[PDB]
Design a protein around this ligand. Structure first.
Ligand code: PXG
Ligand code: PXG
Lengths: 421, 421
C-alpha cells in the first residue's frame, strides 16, 4: 500500500534513520523513548529489527485488550467494507444500536459519542454549564467548575485553562474563566468550594493518571459524591484512563459504589484502534444539548461504533477486570517485597489493578537510567512527571508473560541500584 | 457475526422508524431528526436499510471526497490494522515519521502536527500562535489576540464557542475564553483596522466559509489579507479542513490566490472519511514553539490513521480529483443557473467553487425543507446550513454519468418545488 511503498523508497534502514525522519518532519512536542515499533500483538511489541518487548504503557490504558486484538480488527474490517461515515446529519444502522449498547452496559439514559478524551471533557463541561444556566438557573456566565490540582484531561485551551501543570498552560493564555482548583484527595477543600452556589460541577479522576497514579484515601469519591449531591452539583468522573477494567472493576468509581452524574470514557473504548470517546448522563442533564448546540464531524461514526461494541464485549468475555485485579495485586506485592529497603531511592509503589507506578527520588537517581535499563531488559515504559515510573500493560497479558515481565522489572531496578553503588 | 451485528439483530429493528426511535431514546439529541437510515456506501452512492439508492451530496461536509469505502483506502486500513494501530508518540514507530514527511513534502511545510479532529487542529493552531506571539513577537503576558470572521466555524470546543457569532454555538456555554476579535468576512478594510492592534498574534480564516453558507469572498481577498498580516508580523492561519484537498478544484483553496498559509489546517478528507485525523502544518520557527510536554494527544499521529491518510492523499493525486472537481463543478453551476435562474424566483444565489456548491433560497418565499424533501424524493441526500443554504457537496469520485444524472435530479427538484408553488 502507499505507506509501505513510500517508506521503502525513503531507504530507512536503521532505527537512527527513523529517529532522523521524525526529528525533521514531525512537530517536536514529544521526547519519545528511542525505539521504533513496527508490530504489536497482545502484550508484546516488536521493533524494526525484530527485537521483542513487553508494552508497559499500552496507550496509557488505551490498549487494555492488547495490540491488534483479532476480534476488534475483524469488527473494524467488516464495518469498514460497508460504511464508515455518514455524519449525524443522516441516520445509519449502527450509531443508535451502539449507543443503546453503551447505555445499557453503564446504566445511563443518553450517550454522546465524540472522538478524543479532550473532546469528551469539553463536552461534559459544556453540558454542565448549560444545565447550570437552564435547570439550576444560576446567573448568566457565572457557572463554576471545581477541578483538582495536577488533573489532566487534555490539551485544548480550556483544558490548559484548568491545569496546574506549568508546561500545560504556560504561554497559551488568555485562559477560559470559571474554574476553582482544589487539592486532590481532600474532602474538606471540596466541601469548602461547594459552598459557592454558582458551582455547576466537580470534575475528578478516581485515580489521577498523568498526575502520577495518585490513589486517593478510602472513601474519597463516595464522600465527594454525597457532598455534591447535597448541593445539586454534578459529579463528572473522568474514567478515560481508569475505566474499562484497568483498576480491577468495570469503572474505577465502582470501588466506591459511585455512579457518576456524568461519565467520561475513551482510550480502551476502542481497544486503541480508532479514536472514540463517550459522555454519558441522565436525560434531564444530557438533553440540554439541543439540536445544533453541539456537534462533531466524526463523533459517532459507524466504524468507530462497530469497533467500540466489540472492544467492550472483549472486556467482559475475557474477564479482564478479574485479571487486572489478580495480576496487579501480585505485581505490587512482588515489587514491594523485592525492592522496598533494597532500593532506597524508591519512594512509593502504588496503584490499583494494573494501573501501577513506582515513584523514585530524582535527586538520588536519574530516572531516565531506570527507563533505559527497563528497555535493555525488554520492558517499554514512559514515566510521568519525570520521576513517576508507570507500569500499565495490556490486561490480556498472560500469567506467564506477567511473571516474566515482573522479573525483568525488578531486575532492572536492582541493576540501576547496583550501578549507583 | 461481529458483536454490533449480533446485538443489533437482537433489537429487532425492522423499519426506519424503529431506528429513529432507538436514536431518540439512547443517543444524545444534539442533531436534528434525520430523514434516512443509511446502511452502506460506495463511491458517490449510499443505500438505506430498505435498499433504496441515493447520491450523497453532503459527503461528510467534504470528508468523503474519495467516495464511501474507497477500496484502496479500506485496503490500507485493513493492512495496517493487522500490524500496529497505536503506540503513542511516547514511543517511535515505522509509520508516523514517514507519513509526516509525505505530508510535509506534499504541502510544502517544515513540520507536521497530527491531531484527530478539526476542532483539535484549530485549538492546536491557536495555542501555537499564542505561544509564538509571546515568545517571538514578545507581546505582553496574556495579551495575545486572534482575529476571526463573523459566521466562522471551526468546531465545538469551549474556545471555538468563545470565538463564534452563531447563537446556538455559544449560548449558555460560557464564561468564554478571552482574546478574540471578530470582523466581517470578505472585508479587507475591517481586517486592516483590526491589525492596528500590536497584540494580534494571528488572523484565522476560511478561504470559503463552509458552515457559514459557502460564502465565496471577492477576488483577491486572501491575497490581500496575507499581505496585511505580513506587514504587521501576524500569522495567517488558514482553515482548509472543509475547502482543502481538491474540493474547490485545487489542492488547497488558498491556491486560488497563490497563498501559502503561515499555518495550514487539514482534516476531513485527509482520511477519506475512514478515521478521524487532522493536521496543523507550519514553518519550523513557528511550529517549534511546541516543545516536549507542552502539547499532546493520545491518538494524534497513530500509525493506523497515518497509513490511511497517506493512501487517502495519494488517491486525490492519482485520480486527479482537483481536475475532476473543477470540471464537474463548473458544469454543475452552469446547468443550475441556466435552468433555475429566472425560472425559480425564491433562489437568491447559486455559488461555489469546484464541487463545493450552494443554492441559497429566500426562506420568506419558500420553506427550505420542502426543497430538502423533494431532493430526497429524487434520490439526492443533502443537508442545508443556516436553514436556507442548500449544499451540494458530493464525493469528487462521482462519475461523469452519475454527475449528469444527479444534476438533472437536482434541477428537477428545484423546478418541481416551484411548480408546487
Ligand atoms: C484521565 C484523562 N482524561 C482525558 C485525557 C485526554 O484524552 P485524549 O489524549 O484522548 O485527548 C487523558 C489522556 N491521557 C494521556 C496521558 C499521558 C499522555 C497523553 C498524551 O497525549 O501523550 C495522554 C487522560 O489520562
Ligand atoms: C472549516 C472547518 N473547520 C473545522 C471544523 C471542525 O472539524 P471537526 O468536526 O472534525 O471538529 C469543521 C467541521 N465542519 C462541519 C460542518 C457542519 C457540521 C459539522 C458537524 O459537526 O455536524 C461539521 C469545518 O467545516
Amino acid at each position: 500500500t502507499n505507506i509501505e511503498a513510500y517508506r521503502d523508497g525513503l531507504k530507512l534502514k536503521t532505527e537512527e534513520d527513523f529517529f532522523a525522519c521524525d526529528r525533521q518532519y514531525v512537530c517536536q512536542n514529544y521526547a519519545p523513548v528511542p525505539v521504533v515499533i513496527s508490530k504489536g500483538k497482545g502484550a508484546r511489541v516488536w521493533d524494526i529489527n525484530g527485537n521483542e518487548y513487553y508494552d508497559f504503557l499500552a496507550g496509557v490504558s488505551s490498549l487494555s485488550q492488547g495490540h491488534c486484538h483479532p476480534r476488534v480488527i475483524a469488527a473494524l474490517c467488516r464495518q469498514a467494507e460497508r460504511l464508515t461515515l455518514t455524519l449525524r446529519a443522516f441516520g445509519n444502522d449502527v450509531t443508535g444500536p451502539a449507543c443503546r449498547f453503551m447505555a445499557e452496559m453503564f446504566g445511563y439514559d443518553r450517550v454522546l459519542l465524540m472522538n478524543t478524551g479532550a473532546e469528551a471533557g469539553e463536552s461534559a463541561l459544556k453540558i454542565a454549564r448549560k444545565w447550570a444556566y437552564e435547570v439550576k438557573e444560576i446567573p448568566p456566565d457565572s457557572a463554576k467548575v471545581i477541578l483538582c490540582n495536577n488533573n489532566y484531561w487534555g490539551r485544548t485551551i480550556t483544558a490548559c485553562s484548568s491545569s496546574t501543570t506549568f508546561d500545560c498552560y504556560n504561554n497559551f493564555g488568555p485562559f477560559t474563566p470559571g474554574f476553582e482548583l482544589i487539592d486532590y484527595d481532600d474532602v474538606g477543600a471540596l466541601e469548602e468550594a461547594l459552598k459557592d452556589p454558582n458551582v455547576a460541577a466537580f470534575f475528578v479522576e478516581p485515580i489521577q493518571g498523568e498526575g502520577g497514579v495518585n490513589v486517593p484515601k478510602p472513601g474519597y469519591l463516595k464522600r465527594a459524591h454525597e457532598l455534591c449531591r447535597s448541593k445539586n452539583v454534578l459529579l463528572i468522573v473522568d474514567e478515560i484512563q481508569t475505566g474499562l477494567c484497568r483498576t480491577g472493576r468495570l469503572l474505577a468509581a465502582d470501588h466506591d459504589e459511585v455512579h457518576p452524574d456524568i461519565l467520561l470514557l475513551g482510550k480502551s473504548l476502542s481497544a486503541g484502534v480508532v479514536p472514540i470517546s463517550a459522555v454519558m448522563g441522565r436525560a434531564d442533564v444530557m438533553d440540554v444539548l439541543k439540536p445544533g448546540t453541539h456537534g462533531s464531524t466524526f463523533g459517532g461514526n459507524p466504524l468507530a461504533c462497530a469497533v467500540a461494541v466489540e472492544a467492550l464485549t472483549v472486556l467482559k468475555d475475557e474477564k479482564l477486570a478479574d485479571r487486572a485485579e489478580r495480576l496487579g495485586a501480585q505485581f505490587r506485592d512482588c515489587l514491594r517485597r523485592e525492592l522496598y529497603g533494597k532500593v532506597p531511592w524508591i519512594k512509593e509503589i502504588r496503584g490499583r489493578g494494573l494501573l501501577n507506578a513506582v515513584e523514585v527520588d530524582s535527586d538520588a537517581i536519574d530516572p531516565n537510567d531506570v527507563v533505559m535499563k527497563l528497555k535493555e531488559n525488554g520492558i517499554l515504559s514512559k514515566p510521568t512527571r519525570g520521576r513517576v515510573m508507570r507500569f500499565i500493560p495490556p490486561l490480556v497479558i498472560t500469567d506467564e508473560e506477567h511473571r516474566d515481565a515482573t522479573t525483568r522489572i525488578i531486575k532492572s531496578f536492582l541493576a540501576v541500584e547496583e550501578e549507583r553503588k
